[PDB]
Scaffold this active site. Sequence first.
Site, PDB file in Angstrom:
ATOM      1  N   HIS A  53       0.881  -1.330  -0.025  1.00  0.00           N
ATOM      2  CA  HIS A  53      -0.023  -0.013  -0.277  1.00  0.00           C
ATOM      3  C   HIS A  53       0.943   1.354   0.097  1.00  0.00           C
ATOM      4  O   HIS A  53       1.951   1.209   0.306  1.00  0.00           O
ATOM      5  CB  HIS A  53      -0.928   0.188   1.157  1.00  0.00           C
ATOM      6  CG  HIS A  53      -2.142  -0.886   0.932  1.00  0.00           C
ATOM      7  ND1 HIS A  53      -3.129  -0.812   1.976  1.00  0.00           N
ATOM      8  CD2 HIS A  53      -2.343  -2.126   0.388  1.00  0.00           C
ATOM      9  CE1 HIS A  53      -3.955  -1.793   1.783  1.00  0.00           C
ATOM     10  NE2 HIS A  53      -3.423  -2.395   0.574  1.00  0.00           N
ATOM     11  N   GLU A  55       0.898   3.952   1.760  1.00  0.00           N
ATOM     12  CA  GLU A  55       1.107   4.303   3.221  1.00  0.00           C
ATOM     13  C   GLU A  55       2.319   3.360   3.572  1.00  0.00           C
ATOM     14  O   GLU A  55       3.523   3.992   4.320  1.00  0.00           O
ATOM     15  CB  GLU A  55       0.057   4.449   4.125  1.00  0.00           C
ATOM     16  CG  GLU A  55      -1.276   5.147   3.592  1.00  0.00           C
ATOM     17  CD  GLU A  55      -2.091   4.315   2.618  1.00  0.00           C
ATOM     18  OE1 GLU A  55      -1.444   3.777   1.900  1.00  0.00           O
ATOM     19  OE2 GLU A  55      -3.202   3.968   3.047  1.00  0.00           O
ATOM     20  N   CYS A  83      -6.211   2.061   5.398  1.00  0.00           N
ATOM     21  CA  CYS A  83      -6.898   0.649   5.828  1.00  0.00           C
ATOM     22  C   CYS A  83      -6.255   0.513   7.517  1.00  0.00           C
ATOM     23  O   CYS A  83      -5.431   1.236   7.843  1.00  0.00           O
ATOM     24  CB  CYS A  83      -6.496  -0.334   4.997  1.00  0.00           C
ATOM     25  SG  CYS A  83      -4.734  -0.800   5.091  1.00  0.00           S
ATOM     26  N   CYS A  86      -2.301  -0.028   7.428  1.00  0.00           N
ATOM     27  CA  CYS A  86      -1.614   1.286   7.191  1.00  0.00           C
ATOM     28  C   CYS A  86      -1.749   2.148   8.497  1.00  0.00           C
ATOM     29  O   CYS A  86      -0.847   2.871   8.835  1.00  0.00           O
ATOM     30  CB  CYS A  86      -1.837   2.169   6.008  1.00  0.00           C
ATOM     31  SG  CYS A  86      -1.652   1.039   4.532  1.00  0.00           S
TER      32      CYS A  86
HETATM   33 ZN   LIG Z   1      -3.629   0.384   3.547  1.00  0.00          ZN
END
Ligand SMILES: [Zn+2]
EC number: 3.5.4.33
Lengths: 152, 156
Positions: A53, A55, A83, A86
Amino acid sequence: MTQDELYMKEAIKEAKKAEEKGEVPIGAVLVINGEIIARAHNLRETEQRSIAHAEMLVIDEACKALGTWRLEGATLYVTLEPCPMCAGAVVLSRVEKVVFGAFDPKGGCSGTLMNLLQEERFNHQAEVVSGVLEEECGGMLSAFFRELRKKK
Amino acid sequence: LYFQGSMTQDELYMKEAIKEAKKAEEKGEVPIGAVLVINGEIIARAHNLRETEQRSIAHAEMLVIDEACKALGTWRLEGATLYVTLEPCPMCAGAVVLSRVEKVVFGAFDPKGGCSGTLMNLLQEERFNHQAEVVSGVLEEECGGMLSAFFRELRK
Ligand SMILES: [Zn+2]
Ligand SMILES: [Zn+2]
């Protein structure tokens, strides 16, 4: 355009690099004292890593670029609400502030489903600023998926 | 009828996770270890490395999950079981959920930060796209004993 919007524009540029590669266009930059010390975008399908991801990549690059796990004083700009994975990384890396564009009604855990960034039972909480360039950040995701179905 | 006995499969795997936590112990880390099994075999094993690598996301669960993703050439770890000595934190529980890990077996509860049963249970969240089967307490005393030793020496 305000300071937060200025930095979200760079995260948006990252989100467009991911769209170029056919990824969900989600981008992130990590800022300390006005300098973008890391920038990154979603790579889950190019690299086939569930963890890639935007992040997580920017955080790990920040930690590696700085030689420390504790990103004290960092502001994370990301085009979409983190999410839980993260949001957890933000807590564990002591990031001071998270600014995101669009909310994620399906899976967001920095305000929607829950707020792992403001969990007082954790050993760290981050300032949270939402909706910065929300229409651009969210519309980008809608057009990506709408274009995807088109290709059939 | 038989003189010998045995551990369950789960605690045999858990004691490889304990072995990894011991490596973390001798490097001065929080002694948390983890193994990832798919199709009956251990594909990945790691331990906490936050201080060694100065990376906030170098938790044992994150390392083995990334290793398995990279090794399998897929982000989706279908059918995988994760063995970790201590209840996962929110970063790792999220990573379990994102990778569709089928089951998490953990040893000791984390009373301060656990997010697979204690503060919350991110692994059994209806509102998420995936839930993992959770089994707690496997070799609980040995797993928790290292943590409590680590945090007792910290107090002193
Ligand atoms: Zn995430
Ligand atoms: Zn963790």
